[PDB]
From Swiss-Prot, chains A, B:
Domain remark from Swiss-Prot or TrEMBL: In NdvA the ATP-binding domain (NBD) and the transmembrane domain (TMD) are fused.
Segments forming domain ABC transmembrane type-1: 21-301
Keyword Ribonucleoprotein tagged: no
Record family assignment: Belongs to the ABC transporter superfamily. Beta-(1-->2)glucan exporter (TC 3.A.1.108.1) family.
Protein's gene: ndvA
Catalytic reactions of this protein: [(1->2)-beta-D-glucosyl](n)(in) + ATP + H2O = [(1->2)-beta-D-glucosyl](n)(out) + ADP + phosphate + H(+)
SUPFAM superfamilies, A to Z: ABC transporter transmembrane region, P-loop containing nucleoside triphosphate hydrolases
Protein name listed in UniProt: Beta-(1-->2)glucan export ATP-binding/permease protein NdvA
Organism listed in the record: Brucella abortus (strain 2308)
Any one annotated GO CC term: plasma membrane
Length: 556, 556
C-alpha cells in the first residue's frame, strides 16, 4: 500500500508555488461547494412551483450559481494547466541537474540511455498525475465531505445505502490491487527487458546490419514481446471484472434509490424536487467514482515507473561539502602517489601498490601492454572515482581535501574515446574558455593542425558535425580534441591516446607542437608508440598494475 | 484538416485482425443501441404507472436491458483492451523491422537515437488513440445516429435545440483548431530542440563533467524551457476558453430544455416520463460530447508526433526488387573498381578517379594520410550506400544485381568503431555462426589473443560487458572484433583499423596469425603503421581520393 507514499511525494514536488497552489485549492473547494449546492437549489425551485408567490428569486440565484460555476471552471482549467506545465518544467530541470551531476561509474553501470527514457516517462506520468489528481480529486473529495452532513440532515436511509456504495468501491479497489500487484511487477520487468533490448540493438545498427542478423534479432524481440504479453491478460481481465462489478453496483443503487423515492411518494417530508436532487447527487457520485476509478487504474499502471524515478531521486546522496572547503591554486606541478590501489565492483585486476613522485618542469609518459591499468590510473588522477585506500598528494595536498570544482579546473585530459557534441566546430572547440577570441581559436587549431583541413572544406569553421563526429569521418575528432586541450591551457596536460593511426608526419608535427606548448609545465603521455616520447623526462612502464623498474629516461 | 487522414491511417493499422475488430465494432454498436433504448423504456415504465394493471413486465424488461448493458460493457472493455495491446505490440514489431532495415546514412543524418524516442512516443500515443477512439467515438456516434430519428419522430422543438447544440460544438471546435494549430507546431518544434539538447548532453556526460560546463549547459536548457513555455500559454488559454464556452452551452441547453418541459407540462403529447427520458438523453449527450472534446484535445496534442511517425512509415520506399535477383557464388575473389567516385550531400572531398584490379591469392594494403577516403572506399566495397556513377565488379558481376542478403555473407569488415552489445562475450562473439561449437569459438579467440586475458578473469568467457564494452576497458574491443571477424570465416577479409595503439608483441602476433589464417584468401589492410604491411603483396597509397602511382609492393 505505497499509494499514499506516492501521493505524498507527488504533493511534495507540487508544493513549490505556495501562492498558486493555495489559490487552486481555494478555487477547487469553492467550485465543489457550488456543484453540490446547485442540485439543492434545483430542488428548492422545483418545490417552489407548488406554492404561489414571487419565488422567481431562487431561480435567479440558481442561474447566478451556474454562471459562477462556468467562471470557476474556466479559472481552474487555466490555472491547473499553467501550474502543471510550470512544475513539470521545474521538475525536469532539477532532475536533469542531478542526473548530469552523477559520477561516471553510476552512468556506465546503469544509465547509458535508459536514464533519459526513465526521466521522460516519469516526467510525463507526473504531469498527468498532477493535472487529473488536482482537478478530479479535489473536486470529488470536497464534494463528498460537504455531502456527508447534507445526507445526515436529510433522509438517512439513502445515506445508509450510499456509504455502503462507497465501501463497495473501496473494497473492489483493494481486491483489484491485491490481485494485480504481482502481475504489474512482472509486466514492468518484461517491459524493461524489451526496451533494453531495443535500445541496445538500435544503438549498434551498423554491426547488426553488417552481419545478416536482422531476422535473428527481430525474432528474439518477437520472443521478448511474447514473454511480455504472457502476463498482460490476467490484470486487464481483473480490471474488466472491476468495471463490470462497479457498473452493476451503480445500476443496483440507482434502482434502489428509485424504489425508495417511490416509497417516499406515498408519504414523506420534502417533495419531488428533493427526490430528483437526490437522484442527481447519486448520478454525480456515480460519474465521479467512475473517473476516480480510471485514475486509480492509470496510477497503478505508472506505479513502477514512478517508484524507479523516486529511487533515482533519493539515490542522490553524494555530498559535495556545501561549506567552503579547501581549494588549490597556482599548481606548479607536484604529483605524488602513495601506495594507491583500486578494486573494481564484483571484480579484481586494477592497480596494486603504485607510488611515485613528480617534480615540476618535466614530463612523465606511461607505457606498457594493454590492460595494464593506464586509463584507470589517469581517471584516478583526475578522480572520476575515489581510490580504495591511498593518498593522491598534489602540491603536497591530498585529493580528498580539494573541492571538485577546482580539481578539474586546472587539469587537461584528452579522453581515449574522444566524444563530441553535434554542435558546430566553434561551439565544440570553444569550451576551454567561454570568453576567448576567434584569433585564439585559430591559433589553437593551427597548433594542432586541425585548421588546415577545415579551412578548405565545409563552410570553414561553422560546420555541424553529427553525433560523435559521425559526419566528418573519425580522423578529425582526435585533432579537434587535442586542439581543444591546447585551448584549455592548463598546467597539467594529459595525452591519453592522443597519438593514434594518423600520418607519421602529422604525428611528429603534433608531438613537436605540444612539446613546444608544454615545455613550460608538466604533461602526461599515454601512448604505446615509442616515437612520441623522445622528449620525455621521467618515463615508466607498468604491467598489470605492478611497476617493474620505473627507471630513468634511458633504461634497459 | 489532416485529422481525418490521421484517423484513417490509425484505423488502417487497426483493422488488421478483421474478425476481432469486426466483433468489437458489433459489440460496441449493440451496447450503444441498448444504452439508447434504456431511457425510452425508463420513460415507458414511469408512464406505465399512470394506468393500472399487470404492467410489471416492462420493469423486468428494463432490468434485463440493464443486465445486457453490464455484460456488454464487460465484453467490450476486455476485448478492446486485449486487441489494443496486441495491435500496439505488432505495430512496434513491424516499425522496428523497418527502422533497422534503413541504411546507415539515413540513421547518421536524422535518427541516431531520436528515432527510438519518436517510435516509442508514437506507439504509446497510437495505443491510447486506438483504445479511447474506438470505445468513446464509436459509442457516441452510434448514439447520435440512433437518437436523431427518435427525436425527429417525437416533438421537433427539442430536436431543433439539439441540432443547434451540435452546430455550436462543431463550430467552436473548428475555431479552436484554427487558433491552436500554429501554437501546436511551434510547441512541437521547441520540444524537439529541447529533447535533442538533452540527449546530446546526456550521451557524452564524461566530456561535460570533465570541463566544468554544468552551469552553462543547465542555463542553456533553462533558456530552451523559457522559449518553449512562451508559446505554451496561448494554446492552453484557448482550450480553457473553449471549455468554458461549451460548459456555458451545455448549461444553457439544459435551461432551455427545462423551460420547454415546463411548458410541455401544461399541455403536450407524451408524458413527464418521456420528458425526463429526453432530459437523460441531453445529459448523456453533454457528458459524451465533453469526453470527445477532451479526446480531440489529446489528438491535437499528439498530432505532430503522429505526423512524424506516418512520414517515417511512408519514407520506407527502399525497394529490394522482391523478385529473386541474381545472387553470387563461387567467390574466389575478383574485385575490380571502374571509375567510381562519390560526392557527399552538401559537401565535397571523397574519392575521385579510382581504377585498380584485385587478383585472388594476394593481399592489398591501402595507406595514406587521414581524410583521404579509405574508410569510404572500404564501406563502398561493402556497399553501405549506393555509389554515384560507376560499377563495382565482383566476380565479373555488378554489385547492383546481387541481393544485399548474400552480398555481405561473403565479407568480413571490422569497423573503425568496434561496436558491441551489452550481452555476454560468448553472445557477442558467436554471431557469425549460431550453430557453431565452443571448440571453434575457443580456437578463434586464441587465434586473436582475446582468450589469454579473459580465461583468468570474470567467470571466464561468461562476462557481461556493458554498452560499447564500457566494463572491460577498451583494449579488448579490437581483439573481440578481430576474433569475431576470424570466426565469421568469409572469403574477403577487411581489416579496417584492426591494428591500433597496442603492444608491438601483440601486434606482431596478431599480424602473423591473421596472415596464416588468410593465406587461403584475400584480405585488406587499412592502417598507417608501416609495420603491419611487411607481408603485403600489392600496396597502393591514396590521397584526397586521388591516386598518384598505385604501384607494386616495392616502391620508392
Ligand atoms: N568499468 C570497469 N569494470 C571492471 N573492470 C574494469 C572497468 N574498466 C576497466 N576495467 C579493468 O581494468 C583493466 C585496465 O583497464 P584500462 O586501464 O582502462 O586499460 P589500460 O590498462 O590498457 O590502460 C582492464 O583489464 C579491465 O578489465
Ligand atoms: N558522413 C559524411 N558526410 C560528409 N563527409 C564525410 C562523411 N564521412 C566522411 N566524410 C569525409 O570523407 C573524408 C574521408 O573520410 P574517411 O574515408 O572516413 O577517412 P579516411 O579518408 O581516413 O579513410 C573526410 O575528410 C570526411 O570529411
Ligand atoms: O582518418 V582515418 O578513417 O585513416 O582513422
Ligand atoms: O588497452 V589501452 O587503455 O593501453 O588502449
Amino acid at each position: 500500500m505505497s499509494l499514499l507514499k506516492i501521493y505524498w511525494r507527488a504533493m511534495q514536488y507540487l508544493a513549490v508555488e505556495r501562492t498558486a497552489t493555495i489559490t487552486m485549492c481555494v478555487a477547487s473547494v469553492l467550485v465543489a461547494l457550488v456543484t453540490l449546492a446547485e442540485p439543492v437549489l434545483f430542488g428548492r425551485v422545483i418545490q417552489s412551483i407548488s406554492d404561489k408567490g414571487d419565488i422567481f428569486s431562487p431561480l435567479l440565484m440558481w442561474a447566478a450559481l451556474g454562471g459562477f460555476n462556468i467562471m470557476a471552471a474556466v479559472f481552474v482549467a487555466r490555472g491547473a494547466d499553467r501550474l502543471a506545465h510550470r512544475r513539470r518544467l521545474g521538475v525536469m530541470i532539477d532532475s536533469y541537474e542531478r542526473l548530469i551531476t552523477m559520477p561516471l561509474a553510476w552512468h556506465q553501470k546503469r544509465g547509458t540511455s535508459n536514464a533519459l527514457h526513465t526521466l521522460i516517462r516519469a516526467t510525463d506520468s507526473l504531469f498527468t498525475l498532477w493535472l487529473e489528481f488536482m482537478r478530479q480529486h479535489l473536486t470529488t473529495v470536497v464534494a463528498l465531505a460537504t455531502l456527508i452532513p447534507v445526507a445526515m440532515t436529510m433522509d438517512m436511509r439513502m445515506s445508509l445505502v450510499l456509504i455502503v456504495l462507497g465501501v463497495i468501491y473501496v473494497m473492489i479497489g483493494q481486491l483489484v490491487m491485491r490481485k494485480t500487484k504481482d502481475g504489474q511487477a512482472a509486466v514492468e520487468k518484461h517491459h524493461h527487458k524489451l526496451f533494453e533490448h531495443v535500445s541496445d540493438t538500435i544503438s549498434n545498427v551498423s554491426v547488426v546490419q553488417s552481419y545478416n542478423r536482422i531476422a535473428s534479432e527481430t525474432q528474439a524481440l518477437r520472443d521478448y514481446a511474447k514473454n511480455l504479453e504472457n502476463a498482460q491478460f490476467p490484470v486487464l481481465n481483473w480490471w474488466a471484472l472491476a468495471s463490470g462489478l462497479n457498473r452493476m453496483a451503480s445500476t443496483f443503487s440507482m434502482v434502489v434509490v428509485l424504489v425508495l423515492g417511490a416509497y417516499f411518494v406515498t408519504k414523506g417530508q420534502m417533495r419531488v424536487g428533493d427526490v430528483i436532487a437526490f437522484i442527481g447527487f447519486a448520478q454525480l457520485m456515480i460519474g465521479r467514482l467512475d473517473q476516480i476509478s480510471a485514475f486509480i487504474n492509470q496510477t497503478v499502471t505508472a506505479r513502477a515507473k514512478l517508484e524507479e524515478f523516486f529511487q533515482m531521486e533519493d539515490a542522490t546522496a553524494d555530498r559535495q561539502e556545501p561549506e567552503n572547503v579547501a581549494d588549490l591554486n597556482d599548481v606548479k606541478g607536484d604529483i605524488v602517489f602513495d601506495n594507491v590501489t583500486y578494486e573494481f565492483p564484483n571484480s579484481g585486476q586494477g592497480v596494486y601498490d603504485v607510488s611515485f613522485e613528480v617534480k615540476p618542469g618535466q614530463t612523465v609518459a606511461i607505457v606498457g601492454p594493454t590492460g595494464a591499468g593506464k586509463t584507470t590510473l589517469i581517471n584516478l588522477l583526475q578522480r572520476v572515482f575515489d581510490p580504495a585506500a591511498g593518498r593522491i598528494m598534489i602540491d603536497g595536498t591530498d585529493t580528498r581535501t580539494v573541492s571538485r570544482r577546482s580539481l578539474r579546473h586546472a587539469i587537461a585530459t584528452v579522453f581515449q574515446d574522444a566524444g563530441l557534441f553535434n554542435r558546430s566546430v566553434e561551439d565544440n572547440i570553444r569550451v576551454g574558455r567561454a570568453n576567448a577570441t576567434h584569433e585564439e581559436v585559430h591559433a589553437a587549431a593551427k597548433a594542432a593542425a586541425a585548421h588546415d583541413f577545415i579551412l578548405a572544406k565545409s563552410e570553414g569553421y561553422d560546420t555541424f558535425v553529427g553525433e560523435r563526429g559521425s559526419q566528418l569521418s573519425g580522423g578529425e575528432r582526435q585533432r579537434l580534441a587535442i586542439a581543444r586541450a591546447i585551448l584549455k591551457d592548463s598546467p597539467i596536460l594529459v595525452l591519453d591516446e592522443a597519438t593514434s593511426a594518423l600520418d607519421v608526419e602529422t604525428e611528429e608535427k603534433v608531438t613537436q607542437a605540444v612539446d613546444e606548448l608544454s615545455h613550460n609545465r608538466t604533461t602526461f603521455i599515454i601512448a604505446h608508440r615509442l616515437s612520441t616520447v623522445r622528449s620525455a623526462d621521467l618515463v615508466l612502464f607498468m604491467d598489470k598494475g605492478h611497476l617493474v623498474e620505473s627507471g630513468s629516461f634511458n633504461e634497459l
